[PDB]
């Protein structure tokens, strides 16, 4: 019962209208002696999915979703500061608003020994630095919604052009769970949310 009590308290403070929510959440969890890693890698993912399922069933509104995940995003940021050879480039495409999952991915990958650099909406000359050498062993793209899929295909195409097809590109996100075949048009080398498959297929360890 206890783990669901703790998640519900994470969700209740995240969704709640009253301020200071994540400072209060951090105090209560550490007073309960939940360590920082499992706050990061277990509770915040689990509370995020429970918030998502609460929206599926029309029990919380869009703005509650917006404030709760942005708060959990704020908490996850601070926890990863406290607790920390291949390198991947993790790209959040322009106008992609589902961003918590890529933070969870980067911390998972770093824990498995893969260095990650997270970039938001990189242009052609943002990318072109980072592909002019063999600096990154792969690029990773998150995609949350169908209206981002065309922008993701342009990213893969532009990544392919700045390297003549030699940059390996994996795609994950909330789209992959529902409709992974919708990203099969983008020309990525790999469409999965399984990080062990990304790691094995690109040989990142
Ligand atoms: C939270 C959420 C949002 C939040 C985002 C909060 C944030 N800052 O991150 C907000 C409120 C911004 C939001 C709004 C939108 N989103 Co929304 N919302 C959701 C919701 C409820 C949960 C998604 C979530 O956070 N899941 C939990 C996270 C942790 O999982 P994840 O993101 O999938 O990431 C995991 C995996 O995908 C994987 N992973 C992620 N990225 C990558 C990358 C790689 C390379 C790999 C290997 C793995 C990987 O690892 C992660 C952890 O396991 C879902 C519905 C649902 N899923 O139940 C939608 C959903 C994704 N949203 C959707 C939509 C449509 C939107 C909007 C684009 C438009 C709209 N009409 O709402 C807007 C954004 C633009 C706008 N505002 O106009 C749709 C997408 C389907 C579609 N397009 O038809 C969904 C599915 C809801 C729905 N059924 O309508 N959303
Ligand atoms: Cl601490
Ligand atoms: Cl939504
Ligand atoms: Cl980290």
Residue numbers in the entry: 0 to 83, 92 to 212
Question: What does the study report here?
Answer:
Among purple photosynthetic bacteria, the transcription factor CrtJ is a major regulator of photosystem gene expression. Recently, CrtJ’s activity was shown to be modulated by two size variants of a B12 binding co-regulator called SAerR and LAerR in Rhodobacter capsulatus. The short form, SAerR, promotes CrtJ repression, while the longer variant, LAerR, converts CrtJ into an activator.
In this study, we solved the crystal structure of R. capsulatus SAerR at a 2.25 Å resolution. The solved crystal structure of SAerR containing bound cobalamin has a four-helix bundle cap followed by an α/β Rossman fold. A flexible loop between the four-helix bundle and the α/β Rossman fold is not resolved in the structure. B12 is nestled between the four-helix bundle cap on the left and the Rossman fold on the right. The corrin ring is anchored in place by His145 in the Rossman fold that functions as the lower ligand to the Co in cobalamin. In SAerR, His10 is not present, as this variant is 40 AA shorter at the amino terminus relative to LAerR. In this case, the best fit for an upper axial ligand in the SAerR electron density map is an atom of Cl (dappled ball in Figure 2B,C). SAerR crystals were grown in a high concentration of NaCl, so Cl appears to have replaced the upper ligand –OH that was originally present in hydroxycobalamin that was light-attached to SAerR. Two additional Cl atoms were found in the structure, as well as a molecule of the additive 1,6- hexandiol that we used for the optimization of crystal growth. Analysis of the region near the upper Cl axial ligand shows that it is protected by two aromatic residues, Trp94 and Phe101, in SAerR.
